Each structure stands twice: as structure tokens, then as C-alpha cells.
Design an enzyme around this catalytic site. Structure first.
Site, mmCIF file in Angstrom:
data_model
loop_
_atom_site.group_PDB
_atom_site.id
_atom_site.type_symbol
_atom_site.label_atom_id
_atom_site.label_comp_id
_atom_site.label_asym_id
_atom_site.label_seq_id
_atom_site.Cartn_x
_atom_site.Cartn_y
_atom_site.Cartn_z
ATOM 1 N N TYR B 7 0.850 -1.192 0.000
ATOM 2 C CA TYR B 7 0.000 0.000 0.000
ATOM 3 C C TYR B 7 0.875 1.228 0.000
ATOM 4 O O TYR B 7 2.088 1.086 0.037
ATOM 5 C CB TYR B 7 -0.947 -0.019 1.215
ATOM 6 C CG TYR B 7 -2.054 1.026 1.167
ATOM 7 C CD1 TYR B 7 -3.154 0.869 0.326
ATOM 8 C CD2 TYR B 7 -2.036 2.138 1.995
ATOM 9 C CE1 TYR B 7 -4.148 1.778 0.283
ATOM 10 C CE2 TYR B 7 -3.083 3.125 1.931
ATOM 11 C CZ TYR B 7 -4.144 2.900 1.091
ATOM 12 O OH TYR B 7 -5.215 3.786 1.021
ATOM 13 N N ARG B 13 -6.878 2.786 3.256
ATOM 14 C CA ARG B 13 -7.650 1.557 3.135
ATOM 15 C C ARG B 13 -6.913 0.265 3.476
ATOM 16 O O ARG B 13 -7.469 -0.836 3.293
ATOM 17 C CB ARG B 13 -8.099 1.442 1.708
ATOM 18 C CG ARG B 13 -9.132 2.388 1.333
ATOM 19 C CD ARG B 13 -9.495 2.118 -0.088
ATOM 20 N NE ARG B 13 -10.324 3.100 -0.689
ATOM 21 C CZ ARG B 13 -11.617 3.168 -0.550
ATOM 22 N NH1 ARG B 13 -12.256 2.354 0.227
ATOM 23 N NH2 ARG B 13 -12.270 4.080 -1.210
ATOM 24 N N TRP B 104 -11.797 15.330 2.451
ATOM 25 C CA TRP B 104 -11.399 15.802 3.788
ATOM 26 C C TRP B 104 -10.005 15.286 4.209
ATOM 27 O O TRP B 104 -9.160 16.060 4.655
ATOM 28 C CB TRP B 104 -12.456 15.401 4.832
ATOM 29 C CG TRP B 104 -12.020 15.682 6.254
ATOM 30 C CD1 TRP B 104 -12.046 16.890 6.889
ATOM 31 C CD2 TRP B 104 -11.543 14.747 7.205
ATOM 32 N NE1 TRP B 104 -11.568 16.773 8.168
ATOM 33 C CE2 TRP B 104 -11.268 15.463 8.403
ATOM 34 C CE3 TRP B 104 -11.318 13.377 7.184
ATOM 35 C CZ2 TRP B 104 -10.787 14.842 9.569
ATOM 36 C CZ3 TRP B 104 -10.818 12.759 8.336
ATOM 37 C CH2 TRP B 104 -10.554 13.497 9.510
#
Ligand SMILES: N[C@@H](CCC(=O)N[C@@H](CS)C(=O)NCC(=O)O)C(=O)O
Ligand SMILES: N[C@@H](CCC(=O)N[C@@H](CS)C(=O)NCC(=O)O)C(=O)O
Lengths: 202, 200
Positions: B7, B13, B104
Site C-alpha cells: 500500500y 484503506r 477531507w
């Protein structure tokens, strides 16, 4: 005593149709509860996440399309033969969900000019990559399944998406997908369901 | 088994997966790549995303499919198929909220960021807190589903940590006890202290 299944969704294919294909293919009886927006006003706050589809299994309620597809897929023997295949099948289901989400505006656009423009703008970015991806998965498969050696929730999901896109994609250029969509569509249970089911815009 | 998680250098996630490994006390290679390395790697993933899991040379995509796999091998999907599906429903639900929070998380200016959050507060964040407060009130053991820690608990815990500066749990005593309980569990606690400090 069989479980009693009730699926709740709007009168439409949408995020419920793979679930309806699983029942059709498995020949498992269920109540196909299609509600209106007005009925939905009352029902929405009593659902776990504020959405449909929902599944009621003998008095117990489950939300989320892909959680429902997980449960039924598992019960119906449509999640492969080991936990790795199951996870790869569910990965495909989740990948198609991203495409489904991108297509929502297109599905709901009733003006044909505007709808063609929505689709055009997703063609290179999402639709063509989808077709190429799944053409290749099938090319590399020895049995013409998306994962493993038997029909799974992933096959039904890709099948359903191809049907969704039928009028906008040419499968002559994707012979694996062309063969696949005809094979799944001819399966007993699925074939009768496609003929039977209410014809809705989405 | 040889697990490699790929990742970005971030929670994002992948973090629930990292928490599953931590809680299960299962070793894995935490492969964090740069945005530049990802340009190269992207087309050879199954779906053009991370996270990815490599299990002794075989590759699996989709954070929730990875969660389903690892969750099932670690006993973090309850005790039957119904619990598993309810656990995964919660996971998929929180993924909607994560998707809504993407702008955000990636906006670094403080007043623009606060404006993003406030426009999501009543529509998404508040419903989330009420939902999971109620799920806990319904539990006799303080788990989101069933009687034992699951992927659902880890997912709700991670989202609450994500929102820790923005959310008062003053009116959500169940969630406040929950956040504390999960964060103190062997393996989780050490992971939270050890893990690389990232903005997202
Ligand atoms: N994570 C979801 C989303 C389901 C969803 O967004 N359903 C839409 C219809 S496609 C809906 O319930 N719309 C009415 C509403 O949200 O009030 C699932 O896959 O079941
Ligand atoms: N359905 C997904 C999506 C994963 C995803 O959107 N990953 C982002 C980072 S949060 C990503 O790969 N961005 C790089 C890219 O899409 O090229 C999953 O749950 O794994």
C-alpha cells in the site's frame, strides 16, 4: 424447515439483480419485495444502514448487497472451493461495484443525448478497462469462468454488468466475453428469470 | 505463511488489514510504496489499486476481499456464516463513509478541511455515531457483531481513530468504552505505538 427469504429493493434491477440471479440459479424460493419510494420513506430508518437491498432470513435482517451476495453465494455453493477462490470471487464483486457506482448517473439519465455523453465520458476511463480486464481473466481460464472451475457470484456479477451495458458495447471484439455472456444466460434458472423478470429502466 | 501487504505509506484503506495482522499476531511484510513507484506497479495489479496482498507468490486485490480472507483465517469473522455476513455488511457500510471522507483526509489547509468536515457532519458522521452506538447498546459484550472481536470492531475502531480530533464521544458512552477496549488489546496497542506516523 427451509429458511424463508425476503429481498427488499425498489422495482428495479440495480444493486439487487445479482442477488436475484443467485436465487434463480440456485432455484431457491424467495419473496421479491419491490417497494416504492413512498413505502421507502417509512422503511429507511428501520434498516441497519439506511439502504436497500435488504435480506430478511426467517426474521433476521441483513443489509448490504455484497454481504447478502456473500451469504447466499456461500449457501448456494457459488464461492469456489477454497478460501482463496472465495476471496478472489469477492474481489471481482467489489471491483464491479466501483464500475456500477460510476454508471449510476448513466443508468438514471432518460435523455438519450445526455445519456450517450455520460457513457462516452466513462468509455476510455472505465468501460474499456472493464472489458479488457475480464476478457483477459476469461482468456487465461481453462473453463470459461472468472475464478476457478465452476460458476460463482463473480460470473453472475460480470454477466449482469455485460447485460447492463449490452446496448453500448460491441462484444464481437471480445470473443471470450461474448461466449461467457451467452453461456451464463443459457443456464437454467437464469434463462427463465431473465424472461420472467419485471422490465424496468434500471 | 509469507504475507506481503502493498500500500502507500499511509493508513488509508490498508489499516484495518494492518490491525487484523496485529491482533492475530501474524507476521507480514508491510510494503509501503511511493506515488512514483505506484505509476509503474499499477497495471500489474488485478484492478489498478492498492491495497494488495501477496500470499506466497499469489496476489489478491480489494481491501475487503483481503479482510474477508485474513479475517476468516484468523477467526475474526464470528462463528457462522450469518455473523460473517453481518460483519462484512458493517465493513462495507464504513467503506461508504471512508469514501465520503476522502476529500477531507487529503485537504491539508485547516479552514478548507473544517468546511469539508462540517458539510458531512449531519449527513454522514452523526448518523455513523448513532448507528454504531446503537449496535453496541444491543450487544451484551460490547462487540459490533456477536460475542467476540471481529473485523467489524476493528473497522469501526479505525474510523473512530480517524475522526478522533473531530468527534466528541461525550454523548456516545458505548463507543467511547469500545474505542478504549479495542485500542488496549494485545497487538493493537503495540501496533498503534509502532506504526509509521502519516497524515492519512
Ligand atoms: N453499500 C450499498 C449501497 C446500497 C444503496 O446505496 N442503495 C440505494 C439504491 S441503489 C438506496 O438504498 N437508495 C435509497 C436511499 O439511500 O435512501 C449496498 O451495496 O447495498
Ligand atoms: N475497492 C477498493 C479501492 C482501493 C483504492 O481506491 N485505493 C486507492 C488508495 S485509497 C488507490 O489504489 N489509489 C491509486 C489508484 O487508484 O491508482 C478497495 O477497497 O481496495
Amino acid at each position: 424447515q427451509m429458511e424463508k427469504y425476503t429481498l427488499t429493493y425498489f422495482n428495479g434491477r440495480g444493486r439487487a439483480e445479482v442477488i436475484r440471479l443467485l436465487f434463480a440459479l440456485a432455484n431457491v424460493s424467495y419473496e421479491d419485495n419491490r417497494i416504492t419510494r413512498d413505502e421507502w420513506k417509512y422503511l429507511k430508518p428501520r434498516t441497519p444502514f439506511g439502504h436497500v437491498p435488504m435480506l430478511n432470513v426467517s426474521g433476521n435482517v441483513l443489509g448490504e448487497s455484497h454481504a447478502i451476495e456473500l451469504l447466499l453465494g456461500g449457501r448456494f455453493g457459488l464461492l469456489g472451493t477454497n478460501d482463496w477462490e472465495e476471496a478472489k470471487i469477492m474481489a471481482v464483486v467489489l471491483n464491479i461495484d466501483e464500475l456500477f457506482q460510476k454508471l449510476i448517473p448513466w443508468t438514471h439519465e432518460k435523455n438519450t443525448t445526455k445519456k450517450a455523453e455520460l457513457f462516452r465520458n466513462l468509455s476510455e476511463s472505465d468501460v474499456m478497462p472493464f472489458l479488457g480486464r475480464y476478457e483477459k481473466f476469461l482468456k487465461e481460464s481453462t473453463t470459461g469462468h472468472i475464478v476457478g472451475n465452476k460458476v460463482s457470484v463473480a460470473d453472475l456479477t460480470v454477466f449482469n454488468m455485460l447485460m447492463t451495458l449490452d446496448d453500448e458495447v460491441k462484444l464481437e471484439e471480445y470473443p471470450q466475453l461474448a461466449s461467457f455472456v451467452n453461456k451464463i444466460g443459457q443456464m437454467p434458472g437464469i434463462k427463465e428469470w431473465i424472461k420472467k423478470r419485471p422490465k424496468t429502466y434500471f
